[PDB]
């Protein structure tokens with residue numbers, strides 16, 4: 001509808017796949033080469049389904065900060081025959097607050113879904129399903145089951161992936177450029 005949704009759509013059309021684990025279907029953000037991210041509560045194993053194709057997992061790492069606190073991001077490398085467009089230059093370098101973000105989801109249940117969530121707060125600490133979690137972004141939209149893995153963007157930046165909510169607010173794990181250096 002506007003330049004926010006334009007940027008969000010460009011990311012969804014080229015850098016997302018549908019990931020299925022034993023814990024369900026997730027939006028999964030491809031970042032570069034065969035490297036994607038997913039919420040850690042997806043419980044990635046040795047095998048994952050990517051757009052309904054059985055795919056070996058070459059590596060999976062549940063990220064924690066240097067206080068040894070959960071970040072709720074799992075970096076996955078996929079035994080896929082195709083690379084993602086490299087979008088690492090759209091990742092923020094520092095923890096920050098944002099205006100005018102969009103949360104975008106693509107699953108069987110919620111195809112081509114875009115939500116203007118508005119102002120995004122650097123919330124920091126959250127007890128997420130009982131797990132102390134750092135680097136949480138918060139937005140005042142009543143997000144629901146089906147939206148985990150959803151991509152949070154502003155014009156020109158990919159800032160987070162949706163990991164939970166409390167019925168009134170939604171919570172995203174930060175994406176930082178430093179997670180994907182090689």
Ligand SMILES: Cc1nsc(N2CCO[C@H](C)[C@H]2C)n1
Pocket residue numbers: 110142144
């Ligand atoms: C905030 C909000 N507005 S409509 C909505 N949902 C969730 C996604 O699509 C469903 C069909 C619909 C019931 N959630």
